[PDB]
Amino acid sequence: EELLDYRNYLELDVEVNRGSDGWLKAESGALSTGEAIGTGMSILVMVVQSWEEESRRLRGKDISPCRLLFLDQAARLDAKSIATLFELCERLQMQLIIAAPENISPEKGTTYKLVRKVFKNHEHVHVVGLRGFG
Amino acid sequence: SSKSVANIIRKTIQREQNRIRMLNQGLQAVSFGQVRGVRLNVNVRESHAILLDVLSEQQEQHQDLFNSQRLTFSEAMAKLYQRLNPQVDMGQRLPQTIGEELLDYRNYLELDVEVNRGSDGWLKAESGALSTGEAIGTGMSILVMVVQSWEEESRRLRGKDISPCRLLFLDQAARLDAKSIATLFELCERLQMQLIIAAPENISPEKGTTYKLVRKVFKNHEHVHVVGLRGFG
Amino acid sequence: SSTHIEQFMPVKLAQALANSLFPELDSQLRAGRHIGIDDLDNHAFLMDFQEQLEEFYARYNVELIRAPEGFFYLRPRSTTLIPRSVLSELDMMVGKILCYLYLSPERLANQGIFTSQELYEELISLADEGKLMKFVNQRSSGSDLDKQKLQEKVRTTLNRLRRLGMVYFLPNNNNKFTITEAVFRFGADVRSGDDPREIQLRMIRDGEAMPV
Amino acid sequence: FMPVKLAQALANSLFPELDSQLRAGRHIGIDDLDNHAFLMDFQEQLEEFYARYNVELIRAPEGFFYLRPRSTTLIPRSVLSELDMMVGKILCYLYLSPERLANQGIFTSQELYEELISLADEGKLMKFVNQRSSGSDLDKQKLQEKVRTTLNRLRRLGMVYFLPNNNNKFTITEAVFRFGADVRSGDDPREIQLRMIR
Amino acid sequence: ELVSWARKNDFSIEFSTLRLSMQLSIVANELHRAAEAAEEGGDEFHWHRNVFAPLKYSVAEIFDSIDMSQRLMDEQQNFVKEDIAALLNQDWQAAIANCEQLLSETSGTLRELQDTLEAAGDKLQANLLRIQDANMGSGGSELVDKLVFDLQSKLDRIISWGQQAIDLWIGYDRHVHKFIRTAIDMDKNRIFSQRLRQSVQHYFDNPWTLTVANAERLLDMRDEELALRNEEVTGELPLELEYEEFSEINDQLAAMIEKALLVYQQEQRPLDLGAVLRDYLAQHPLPRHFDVARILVDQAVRLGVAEADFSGLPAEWLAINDYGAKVQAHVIDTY
Amino acid sequence: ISLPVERLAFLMAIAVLNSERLDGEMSEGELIDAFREVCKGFEQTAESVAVRANNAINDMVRQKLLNRFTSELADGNAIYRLTPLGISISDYYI
Amino acid sequence: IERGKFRSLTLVNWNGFFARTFDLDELVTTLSGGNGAGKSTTMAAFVTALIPDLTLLHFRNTTEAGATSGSRDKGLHGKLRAGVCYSTLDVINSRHQRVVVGVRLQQVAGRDRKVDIKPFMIQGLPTAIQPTQLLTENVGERQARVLPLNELKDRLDEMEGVQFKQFNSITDYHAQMFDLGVIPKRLRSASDRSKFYRLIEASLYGGISSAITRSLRDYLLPENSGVRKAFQDMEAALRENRITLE
Amino acid sequence: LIPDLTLLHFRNTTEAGATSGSRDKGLHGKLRAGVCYSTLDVINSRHQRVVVGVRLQQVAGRDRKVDIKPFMIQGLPTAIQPTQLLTENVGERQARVLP
DNA sequence: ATATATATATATATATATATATATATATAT
DNA sequence: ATATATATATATATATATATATATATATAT
Ligand SMILES: Nc1ncnc2c1ncn2[C@@H]1O[C@H](COP(=O)(O)OP(=O)(O)OP(=O)(O)O)[C@@H](O)[C@H]1O
Numbered sequence A: 001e002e003l004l005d006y007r008n009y010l011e012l013d014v015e016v017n018r019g020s021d022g023w024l025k026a027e028s029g030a031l032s033t034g035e036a037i038g039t040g041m042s043i044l045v046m047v048v049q050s051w052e053e054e055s056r057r058l059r060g061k062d063i064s065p066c067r068l069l070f071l072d073q074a075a076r077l078d079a080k081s082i083a084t085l086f087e088l089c090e091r092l093q094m095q096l097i098i099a100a101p102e103n104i105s106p107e108k109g110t111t112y113k114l115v116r117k118v119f120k121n122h123e124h125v126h127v128v129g130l131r132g133f134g
Numbered sequence B: 001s002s003k004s005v006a007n008i009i010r011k012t013i014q015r016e017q018n019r020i021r022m023l024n025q026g027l028q029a030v031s032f033g034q035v036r037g038v039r040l041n042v043n044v045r046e047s048h049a050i051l052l053d054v055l056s057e058q059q060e061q062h063q064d065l066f067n068s069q070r071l072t073f074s075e076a077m078a079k080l081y082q083r084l085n086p087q088v089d090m091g092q093r094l095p096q097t098i099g100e101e102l103l104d105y106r107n108y109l110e111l112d113v114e115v116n117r118g119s120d121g122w123l124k125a126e127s128g129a130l131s132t133g134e135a136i137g138t139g140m141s142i143l144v145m146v147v148q149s150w151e152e153e154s155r156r157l158r159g160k161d162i163s164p165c166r167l168l169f170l171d172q173a174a175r176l177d178a179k180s181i182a183t184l185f186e187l188c189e190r191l192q193m194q195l196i197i198a199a200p201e202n203i204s205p206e207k208g209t210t211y212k213l214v215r216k217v218f219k220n221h222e223h224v225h226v227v228g229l230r231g232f233g
Numbered sequence C: 001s002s003t004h005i006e007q008f009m010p011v012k013l014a015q016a017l018a019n020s021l022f023p024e025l026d027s028q029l030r031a032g033r034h035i036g037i038d039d040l041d042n043h044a045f046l047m048d049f050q051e052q053l054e055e056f057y058a059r060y061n062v063e064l065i066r067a068p069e070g071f072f073y074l075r076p077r078s079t080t081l082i083p084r085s086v087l088s089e090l091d092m093m094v095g096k097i098l099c100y101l102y103l104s105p106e107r108l109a110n111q112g113i114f115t116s117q118e119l120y121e122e123l124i125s126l127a128d129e130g131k132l133m134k135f136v137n138q139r140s141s142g143s144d145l146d147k148q149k150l151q152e153k154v155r156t157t158l159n160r161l162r163r164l165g166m167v168y169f170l171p172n173n174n175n176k177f178t179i180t181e182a183v184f185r186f187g188a189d190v191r192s193g194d195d196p197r198e199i200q201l202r203m204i205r206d207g208e209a210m211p212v
Numbered sequence D: 001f002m003p004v005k006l007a008q009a010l011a012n013s014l015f016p017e018l019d020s021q022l023r024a025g026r027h028i029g030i031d032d033l034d035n036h037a038f039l040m041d042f043q044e045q046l047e048e049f050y051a052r053y054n055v056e057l058i059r060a061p062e063g064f065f066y067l068r069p070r071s072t073t074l075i076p077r078s079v080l081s082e083l084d085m086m087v088g089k090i091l092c093y094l095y096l097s098p099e100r101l102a103n104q105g106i107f108t109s110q111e112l113y114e115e116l117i118s119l120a121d122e123g124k125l126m127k128f129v130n131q132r133s134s135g136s137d138l139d140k141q142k143l144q145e146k147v148r149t150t151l152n153r154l155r156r157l158g159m160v161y162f163l164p165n166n167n168n169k170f171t172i173t174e175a176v177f178r179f180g181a182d183v184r185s186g187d188d189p190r191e192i193q194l195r196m197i198r
Numbered sequence E: 001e002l003v004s005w006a007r008k009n010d011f012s013i014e015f016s017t018l019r020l021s022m023q024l025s026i027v028a029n030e031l032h033r034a035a036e037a038a039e040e041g042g043d044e045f046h047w048h049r050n051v052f053a054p055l056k057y058s059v060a061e062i063f064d065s066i067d068m069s070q071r072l073m074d075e076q077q078n079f080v081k082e083d084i085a086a087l088l089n090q091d092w093q094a095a096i097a098n099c100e101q102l103l104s105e106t107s108g109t110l111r112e113l114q115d116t117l118e119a120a121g122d123k124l125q126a127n128l129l130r131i132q133d134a135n136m137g138s139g140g141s142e143l144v145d146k147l148v149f150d151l152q153s154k155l156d157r158i159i160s161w162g163q164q165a166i167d168l169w170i171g172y173d174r175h176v177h178k179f180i181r182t183a184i185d186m187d188k189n190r191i192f193s194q195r196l197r198q199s200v201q202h203y204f205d206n207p208w209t210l211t212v213a214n215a216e217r218l219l220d221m222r223d224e225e226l227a228l229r230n231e232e233v234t235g236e237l238p239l240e241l242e243y244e245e246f247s248e249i250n251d252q253l254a255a256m257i258e259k260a261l262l263v264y265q266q267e268q269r270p271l272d273l274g275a276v277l278r279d280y281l282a283q284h285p286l287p288r289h290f291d292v293a294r295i296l297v298d299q300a301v302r303l304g305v306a307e308a309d310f311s312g313l314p315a316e317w318l319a320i321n322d323y324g325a326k327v328q329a330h331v332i333d334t335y
Numbered sequence F: 001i002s003l004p005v006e007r008l009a010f011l012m013a014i015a016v017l018n019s020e021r022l023d024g025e026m027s028e029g030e031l032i033d034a035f036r037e038v039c040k041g042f043e044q045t046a047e048s049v050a051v052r053a054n055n056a057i058n059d060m061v062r063q064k065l066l067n068r069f070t071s072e073l074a075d076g077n078a079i080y081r082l083t084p085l086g087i088s089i090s091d092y093y094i
Numbered sequence G: 001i002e003r004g005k006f007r008s009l010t011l012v013n014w015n016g017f018f019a020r021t022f023d024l025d026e027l028v029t030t031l032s033g034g035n036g037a038g039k040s041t042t043m044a045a046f047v048t049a050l051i052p053d054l055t056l057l058h059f060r061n062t063t064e065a066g067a068t069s070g071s072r073d074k075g076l077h078g079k080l081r082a083g084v085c086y087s088t089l090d091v092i093n094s095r096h097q098r099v100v101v102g103v104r105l106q107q108v109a110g111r112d113r114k115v116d117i118k119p120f121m122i123q124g125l126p127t128a129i130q131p132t133q134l135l136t137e138n139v140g141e142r143q144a145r146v147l148p149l150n151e152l153k154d155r156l157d158e159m160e161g162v163q164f165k166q167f168n169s170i171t172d173y174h175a176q177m178f179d180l181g182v183i184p185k186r187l188r189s190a191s192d193r194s195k196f197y198r199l200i201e202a203s204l205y206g207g208i209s210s211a212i213t214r215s216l217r218d219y220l221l222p223e224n225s226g227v228r229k230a231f232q233d234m235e236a237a238l239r240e241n242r243i244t245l246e
Numbered sequence H: 001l002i003p004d005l006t007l008l009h010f011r012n013t014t015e016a017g018a019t020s021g022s023r024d025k026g027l028h029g030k031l032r033a034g035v036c037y038s039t040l041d042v043i044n045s046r047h048q049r050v051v052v053g054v055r056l057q058q059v060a061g062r063d064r065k066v067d068i069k070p071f072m073i074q075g076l077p078t079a080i081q082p083t084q085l086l087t088e089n090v091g092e093r094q095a096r097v098l099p
Numbered sequence I, J: 001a002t003a004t005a006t007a008t009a010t011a012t013a014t015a016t017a018t019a020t021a022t023a024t025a026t027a028t029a030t
C-alpha cells in the first residue's frame, strides 16, 4: 500500500547554506535557536504555498486564500532575523502575529501594549495600540 | 512482619513530611508574572493510608491474595491496592510495575508544587495553566530547592570547612521581562548562586558582568570576537 | 499425520526446547556450569524434563548426569561433539576444601557465607604449605611474594569455580560467597568405601576423572 | 508449542554438528554441500531458533552463513585479536584474480608471512609481538609462531582449509570475504583492499 | 573531623530477665516523676533541678545499663553458637539433641527478653511524648528537648534490637537444622568426612582431576580501532578584552516623561493618550517618534484604567502626528 | 588488648557512628567506609584499604571488641555491634 | 563560611573559539550576540567540563526541548574543531584553593560523529598562570599552539608544587570534584549522574522540566534502606508461608 | 480558526512537544463563567466582509471541559463591529454578553 | 604494572498495542 | 420537526518490550 503512493517514491530533505560551508542537511541539533526558527518559518511558508497551489484547481479563479502565521516568544530572534522574517512575509503577502515581551520593538506594522491589572476584583488587560510609524 | 513494615513506613513518612514542611519556609515570595510565590505540598496519600492501615491491622483477611502462586509479592501488593480503594482507576500499567512502585515509601506522599497565582490562592502548578515566564520562574525555584536539599543532605559527608560551589544556567533569558529577571537576580544573590544567562540583547545592563559575542567569517573559517559591556560611560 | 510434531520430535522434548528458560540454561550447561537446588527455576526445569533433555543431549555424545546429591551437569564422552576439559590440580584441592567447609560444623557461625581469607587459611591448614606453594612457583621456599602469589592463584581458582556453579558470590559482594552442593563432586573418589586405586580406575573408566 | 518445520530442522541428524560449529563461530559456505543445503532449506526457522539466543543467523551476500552475536548474546562471546584481523584481511586480499595464476587456490604459510611483513606497518607488527622489539630474530620467530596460531584459529572458523598434513599449506574459502571491504562501481578490488588494510 | 583529634591525642595500647524488668520499672517510675514535675512547671532553677539534673543523668545511665544487658545477651549468643559448634565436633550424630536443646533455651531467652522490653516500651514512649509536650513551658529548656529527642531513639533503638537479634537468631537456628538435615544426614558415621580429609592431606599421592564441558566461545569480528583527529591546531591568541558602554538616553527620556505625566495622577485629570501623544511628540524629530510613543504609553498605562473598555464600543485610531501615526486608546478615567 | 593509634581511631569512629546511628546496628558496609576514612586521615598505606580494613575488623572481633552476625541481606552480608569491653574502652575517653 | 566560586571558563579550539577565557561573575554573567553568535556553545563547553558522560550529553535546540527529533546526533561533535580541544573550569574552593578541573575533547575520525573525552584536574597552580596560556605553547610570532595531554603533563610536572591528575573514569573525576567542593552531591552511581545532568539541563533550557517534575520525589526525598529491609523481611516471611502452604 | 477539541492543546511554550504531563488541555482556564466568543473578521478577494467565529462555554461538571459552537455571519455592514453584535449596552456600567 | 577482554547496569530511542476522548452520521424517543 | 443515544472512525498518548551505546569494575596475561 505504501508502494502504491507516488510520494513514497520521493526522498525529501531540508538543506541550509550555512556560513563558509556548502549546503548541509538541516539538523535541529546542528543549528542555533534563531537559525532553526528561521528555517522552520521558511518551510511553513513553503507548505502554505504548496497547499494553495494544490487547491487552486478546485476554487474560483479569483479567490486568493488569506495567509497568516504566528510567532510566540519572538524575542528569541535578534533584530536582523526579525527583519529578514518581515521581508520574507511581505514578499509572500503573508500576515504575521508575533508575541514579544517588550524586548523587540519592530517599527513597521501594528503594535499592542498589554498590561494586566486588577479592576473591580477581576483581572483586566489594559490594551493600547499604535500603528503607522515608519 | 507486615505490621513492622507498616510502622516503619509511617515513621519515615512523618519524618520526611516534617523536614519538607520546615524547608518550605525557606522561600520569600518570588514575583514572577502573576505568580507571587512557590511552595511544596507534601501530604500522605489516603489511597495509601488505607493500604498501610490494612497492612498494620488486617493482614490475615486478605491471605487469599498474598499466598496465590500466580501473583508475586509486588503483584500481590498491587492487587491488594486495587482491592481496597477501588475508585482510583489506575491506567494501562501492569500490576508488576505498580507494585514495585508500592514497595517505595516516597510514593506514599503526594508531593506537588503550588503557586500563589495572583489572588486565587495556592493552586497546583501545571504547565498548561501558566505563562512561559511564570513557568520558568517556578521551575528555577524548584531547581534551587533541589540544589539546597542536595547540599544539606551532604553536610555530613563533606568536611566542616567546604561549602560547595553553586551555579545554574538560563538559555533564552529574553523570554523573561525586566521584573522577572530582577527577581531572579535578587533570589540568586540571596542564595549565593551563580547564574550564566544568554540573550540576544543586553537584558541585564546594570548587574554582574556581560560579554558580547560577534561571529565573523574570515578566510573561509569562523572566528568569534568577544567584547565586554559596561553599565555606564 | 504430516505437519505433526510427533513425526520428528517428542511433544515433551519440543515443549522443553520451546521453554523460555531453555536457551540460557543450555548455554550455561555447555559452558560447564553445574546446577544445584539454589537455582530453583533452572533446577525445577531440569527435573521436569530430565529424560527429554538427557536424550536431546545424547545426540551430542554427552551425558546429562544427575549426581545423587541432586545437582545436574554435563559429562562429555570421548566422542563428544562438545569439547571437554579438566580442572587444574589446584582447582581439585580448592574444591575438596570447599566440600570440607560445607560439611564442617566448626564454621556453622558463618551460616554458609565465607571469605577468600578463610578458604586460604583452611587450605593451608589441611594441605602442605610450602609443598603446595611449589606448584605456584617452582622456586618457592616460603617467600612472602610467593605467598601472595599463592593467595592470588587461590582467588583465581575460586572465581573459576564460581563460573562452574560450585560457588556463588553474594548479590552485592564479590569478596564473600556461599558454597553449593555441586562441590560434592570433588569427593566422588571417596564416596564409595573401597580401595582408592580401584575407585580411581572406576571413575576414569566412567569418564568422571582423567589423570594428570 | 513449537513450529513444525523448526522441529524438523532440529531433529535432522545434521543439526548437532552444524549447531556446535555455528556456536563456535564457524562460517558455513557453499563448499559444505550438505550443511549449506540444510541451512538453505531451514533458514526461515533456524533464524528464529538462534534469535531466541540473542544471536542473528546471517546469510552473507556471497552466500555463506554465520552467527553474529548481539550485545545481549546468551552464547559466550569472544573477540579476535588485531593480528587476527590483519591476517584475515591479508587472506581476503589473497583471494585474488591473479591468484589463479599465482597459487591456483593453494597457498603456503610463507606467502602469508611475507605479505604480512611487506604490507603491514612496523609499529603494528611490534604492537603484535611487543613494542620494544626492533627487527630481531627472537621477535620474528615469536611473530611467525603467533601467525601460525592465528591461522589455526581461522581454520576453526572455516576461513582457511588446511591441506591435510602437519605442514602449513592451505586454501582460502569465499567466507573470507567477511574481512573484505565493500565494492563500488569500477573500483579495483586490490586497490580498495589495500586501502582498507593501510 | 575526629580523625585529627585522635591523631593528636596520641593514645594507644547478667542475662536474667528479672533484672531487665527491674530496670524498666525504675525507669518508668523516674520518667513519670520527671514528666509530672515538668508538667507542673516552675522557674528556671525549678525547671533545671526537675528536668535536667534528675531526668538527664538517670535516664542516660539506666538506658545505657539496659543496652549493656542487651550486649551481654549478644555475648551469650556468640558463646552458645561456639559451644554448639564445638559440641558437634566431638559427638557428631549424638550431639543433635544437645544442639537442639541449646537452640531451644537460647530462643526462649531471646523471646523473653523481647517480651520484657515490649512490656514497658509503650508506656515509656507515652511519658516521653508527655515530657515533650511539657518542655515548652520555658524558653531556656532547649537542652531538655534534646533529651526528649535523644532518649526516644535509644529506647526505640533498644526495642529494635530486641527483635532484630531474634530475626538473626531464627536465621542461624534454621541453618543449624539444615546442617543436621544436610551435612550429617549423608555422613551419619562421619566416615566420608575423615576420608575426604585424608584425601586432601594425601591428594597428590594420586592426583586426579574432574571433567567438565568446555564448549568453545563464539569468536567475533573486532570493531575497527578508533583513531582520533590530530592536526596540531595553531592560531592567533586573543588580545586584551576591550569594552563598550550602554547608552542611558532612554532612561533620561523615561524620567522626563514620568515627571511630565505624574501631574495627571496627582490631579486625577482624565488622561487622553491621543492628545497627550500629539502634543508631546512635537518636541522630538521624526525618527525618534516611535521610541517616544512606546515609552509614553508604558508610563500612561500604569496610571489607572479606562472605564470605557468595558462598554463594548471600540475606540478609533486617532492620528497623533503628520506622516501617518495613529493610536487606539480610550480615555483613562479610573485612577 | 592492643589498640594502635589507627585501630583506636577506627573504634572511636565506630562508637560515634553507633551513638548517631538510628537503631544501633552497623553493617560491615559502613565499617569499611569508616576504616577507609580513618586510614586516610592517618596517612599510611601499608596495604590495600580492603585488606587493612578486614584485618583490623577481624582482630577486634577476636580481641573481644566487636561482635559479628551473618545476615545476607545486610550491606556487606554482616552486622557488627560493639561489645561491652569495646563500649568501655571507647567511652573511657568519650 | 565563604562559598567556593567559578572564576572562569576556558574554551580551546571550539567551533569559533580558538582560545577564549570568560571571567565568570560572582553573581551573574550574561552572554549577548545575534543568532549564531556562540552562546549555547559556551554553555555546552561548561556542561561538558562539568558532566563529561557521553551517555548524557545531548545538546538539543532550545526549541523541541526534550522532544525526540530522530536526529541520531547528540550535537556535541559539531561544536568542536579537528585536533585537540580543551574545556576547563577554574574554581576557588571554600579553602581558598585554586583548582582547575577540565576535560580534553577530541573528534573521532570516521563517518559517525563520535567524540572522545578525557577528564583531568590540576591543583596548586599559581594564581598568576592563566589556563589559556597553560594549555597553549607560544610557537611562532605571537602564533601560539595547542598542546595535547602528554605535553601538558610534561609541562606541568616540570613545574613546582602543581599536582596534575588524569582520570581513567568519570566516577573518580566526580569524587575528586566533590572532595574539593565543586559539586553538591556525591555522584557514586550512574543514576546520581543522570539526576545531576537532569537538573543542569533543566536549568539550561529553563523552567519546568518534564523529567524533573515527574520525579520530584526522586529529586527531593532521600532513599531509605530501613523500609526496603522491612519489605525484604516481609517478602521472606511470605515466601516461607507459601512454601508451607504448597 | 480550528474549533476542534481533540487538537486544541494550549501547552506551555516550554514543553512545546513534551507529553501531556497533566490531563488538562489548557483552554478551560482561559475562559470565564458565562458565554465567551472568539470571532475573526475577514475580507475575501471578492471583498465580502465575512465574520467567522465560535461560541465557547465552560461545560459545568466535574472536569474542566469546554463546548464550542462555530458560526458564520455574512453581509454585515462595515459600520458594525464584532463587539457591538455580541454585547448589549445596558444602562449599567458594564455591557452584557448575549447567547 | 598495566593493556585488554568480558559481564553487568543504566540511559535513550524505536516500534507496536491499546485505552480515551472527540467528531460525524444515523436511529429513535420527544 | 426536533434533540439525545448509538456506532464508527480518528488522533492522542500511554506503557511495554526491544536494541543500542556508554560507563564501570575487574579479572587475566605479558
Ligand atoms: N553541532 C553543531 N554542528 C555544526 N554547527 C553547529 C553546531 N552547534 C552549533 N553550530 C553553529 O554554531 C554557531 C553558533 O550556534 P549556537 O548554538 O552557539 O548559537 P546561540 O548563541 O545559541 O544562538 P541563538 O541566540 O540563535 O540561540 C551557529 O552557526 C550554529 O549553526
Ligand SMILES: [Mg+2]
Binding pocket: A072, B131, B132, H013
Ligand atoms: Mg506565552
Ligand SMILES: [Mg+2]
Binding pocket: A032, A033, B171, G039, G040, G062
Ligand atoms: Mg541558543
